[PDB]
């Protein structure tokens, strides 16, 4: 029952290092189609609005 | 990096040995696997136990492998019995730790285990 | 000529493929000079809970 970052404190663990070595700048975020682009549904066709 | 293993004994066929992969702390996971290779084929699986309970095993390991889980050193325990030369391999520890609901096992660790008379 | 190439990656990565470094043994409940990966020092080094 929370849309925005619940109220509280939770430190962070270290995952993983990565060896890449090149300059970074911009960055994207990949999400799941879940609709069909070619024959779009009029709704729900994509997850929950 | 984080966790770690090594560790094993070389044995004649028919013994009985407990591999261990050396605890590195109190970790999350859900499912620990037991999994071997040998160079010219592929790697294979071994065996899964489930913090739930559910245990699975590969079909060529019948009545040789035994899977335990221990929470308080928080270590998976495989006690392997009736040994024929097709174990000589190396043994790794693959962990499950949910990284984006899953995924990056560690089983970057290994115990080269090889089961021979001579 | 059976011709072998071992091209070794030095690069801003978790070294992997090392180990020539060798330990000896180790020594406990005596007053000792350790270095631990780096870390020099002297004391008396005990199983710690
Ligand atoms: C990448 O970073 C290096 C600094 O190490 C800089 O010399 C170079 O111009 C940068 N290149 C780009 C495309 O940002």
């Known amino acids: 029952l929370v849309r925005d970052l619940p109220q509280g404190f939770s430190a962070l663990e270290p995952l993983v290092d990565l060896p890449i070595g090149i300059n970074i700048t911009r960055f994207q975020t990949l999400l799941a189609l879940h609709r069909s682009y070619l024959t779009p549904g009029d709704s729900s066709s994509g997850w929950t609005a | 990096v984080q966790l770690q293993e090594s560790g094993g004994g070389l044995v004649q066929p028919g013994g009985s040995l407990r591999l261990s992969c050396v605890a590195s702390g109190s970790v999350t996971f859900n499912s620990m696997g037991w999994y071997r290779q040998a160079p010219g084929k592929q790697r294979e699986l071994v065996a899964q136990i489930t913090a739930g309970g559910d245990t699975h095993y590969a079909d060529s390991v019948k009545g040789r492998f035994t899977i335990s889980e221990h929470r308080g050193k928080n270590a998976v325990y495989l006690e392997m019995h009736s040994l024929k030369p097709e174990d000589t391999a190396v043994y790794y520890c693959?962990?499950?730790?949910?990284?984006?609901?899953?995924?990056?096992?560690?089983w970057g660790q290994g115990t080269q285990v090889t089961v021979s008379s001579g | 000529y059976r011709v072998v190439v071992l091209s070794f990656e030095l690069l801003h990565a978790p070294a992997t493929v090392c180990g020539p470094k060798k330990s000896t043994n180790l020594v406990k409940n005596k007053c000792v000079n350790f270095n631990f990966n780096g870390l020099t020092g002297t004391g008396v080094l005990t199983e710690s809970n």
């Open positions: 693959h962990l499950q730790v949910p990284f984006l609901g899953g995924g990056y096992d560690y």
